[PDB]
Structure 1
Amino acid sequence: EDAGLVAEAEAVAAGWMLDFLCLSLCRAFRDGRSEDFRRTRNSAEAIIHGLSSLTACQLRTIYICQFLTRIAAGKTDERITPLESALMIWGSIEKEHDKLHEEIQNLIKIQAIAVCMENGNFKEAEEVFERIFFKSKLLMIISQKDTFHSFFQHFSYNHMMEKIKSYVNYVLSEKSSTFLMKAAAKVVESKR
C-alpha cells in the first residue's frame, strides 16, 4: 500500500467529518440540545486536530464552530470571558459585514457586559466594558446595577440568540448537502 495515498484518503475523510460535525453542531445549537452540542463540539475539536492544512472554506468552518462554542458558554487559556472571545472570532471570520453581522456584533458586545451583571459580578461587568469600549451612560447603568434597564431589554440575551440562530440557518442551508450527511440521509430513507 502507498502510505501517501492512504494519508490523502484520511485527509479527504477528515474534511467530510468536519462538514458533518459543523452541520450537526449548528442543528444542536438551533434546537437548544445542550448535551448534543457539547458532544458534537468535542468530536469537531478532536477531528480538527487531525488536519494540519486547511482550505479557505475549511478555515471558515472551524471558526464558525469556535464561535458557536463561545456563544454556548456565554453564561458559563485567556483572561477574557467567552462572549468577548466570540466577539474576536466574529470580527475576524472571512464573511460579509452586512446588516445581520453588525446586529450580531452589537448584541454580543452588550450581552458580554449584561451576563456579568446577571451573575452578580459587577466588577467583572466594568472590566468587560473597559476591554470592549453612550459609553458614559452604559458605564452608569453598570455602576447603578440597572440590569433591567430598557437598553438591556432591547439588547437582550434572547435577541442575541435569535439573531445568531438566523445566521446559523444560512450556514445550515449551505452545508445541508455535504457528502457525509447526504449519504447518511439516503441510507435512513431507504430503510423506510
Structure 2
Amino acid sequence: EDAGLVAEAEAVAAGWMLDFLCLSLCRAFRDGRSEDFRRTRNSAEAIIHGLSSLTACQLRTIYICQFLTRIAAGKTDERITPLESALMIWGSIEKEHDKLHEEIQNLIKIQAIAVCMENGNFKEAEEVFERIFKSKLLMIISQKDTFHSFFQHFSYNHMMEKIKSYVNYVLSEKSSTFLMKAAAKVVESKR
C-alpha cells in the first residue's frame, strides 16, 4: 500500500463530496428546507478540512457555499452582520460582474440595513449603513421608516428571488457532477 496514492484518492473523493454537497446545499436553499440546509452546510464545512490545496473551480464552490450560509443566516469572530459578510464574499468571487451580479449586490446592501430595522435594532442599522456607505437612506433609518417605498422595491423577497435565480444556474452547472450522477443512476435502477 502506497501512502501517497491513498492520500491522493482521499483528495479526489473529497472533491467529489464537495460538489455533491454544494448541489445539495443549493437545492435546500432553493426549496427553503432549513434543517436540511443546516445539515448539508455542516457536512460541507467538515469535508473541506480534508483539502489543503484547491483548484480555481473548488475555491468558487466553497465561496458559493459560504455566501449562501450567510444569506440563510441573514435575519439571525467578526464585528459585522451575516449579510455584510455575504457582501464581502460576493464582491470577491472569481465571477462575471454582469447585471445580475450588481442586482444581487445592491439588494444585499439595502437588506443588510433593512433586516436590522425589521428586528427593531435601529442603532445597528445605522452602524451597518456607516460600514457599507445616502442622506435619504440615513433619514429613513433615523425615522424608523421600515416600510418606506424604497425598501419595497429593494425588498427581502426581491433579494431572495434574485439569489435563487443565481442558485438555479449553479445547480444546473453542477447537476452532472460525478457523485450525484452515479447516485441518480442507482435510484433510477430500482424505479
Q: Mark yes or no: TM-score above 0.5.
A: yes
How far 1:47 moved relative to its partner?
0.4
How far 1:32 moved relative to its partner?
0.2
- Aligned with 1:141: secondary structure? helix
Aligned residues: 191
How far 1:50 moved relative to its partner?
1.0
Superposed CA offset, 1:78-111 (max 9, x none): 0000000000000000000000000000000000
Alpha-carbon separation, structure 2, partners of 1:54 and 1:47:
13
**TM-score, structure 2 length as denominator?**
0.99
**TM-score, structure 1 length as denominator?**
0.99
Alpha-carbon separation, structure 2, partners of 1:74 and 1:55:
29
Alpha-carbon separation, structure 1, partners of 2:156 and 2:185:
38
Superposed CA offset, 1:96-146 (max 9, x none): 0000000000000000000000000000000000000x9000000000000
Superposed CA offset, 1:19-67 (max 9, x none): 0000000000000000000000000000011100000000000000000
Moved over 4 A (4+): none
- Aligned with 2:44: secondary structure? helix
Consecutive unaligned residues in structure 1, runs of 5 or more = none
Consecutive unaligned residues in structure 2, runs of 5 or more = none
How far 1:77 moved relative to its partner?
1.0
Alpha-carbon separation, structure 2, partners of 1:178 and 1:37:
19
Q: Percent identity?
A: 100
- Aligned with 2:84: secondary structure? helix
User: How well do the aligned residues superpose, as a CA RMSD in angstroms?
Assistant: 0.8
Alpha-carbon separation, structure 2, partners of 1:144 and 1:42:
40
- Aligned with 1:77: secondary structure? coil
Correspondence for 1:183: 182
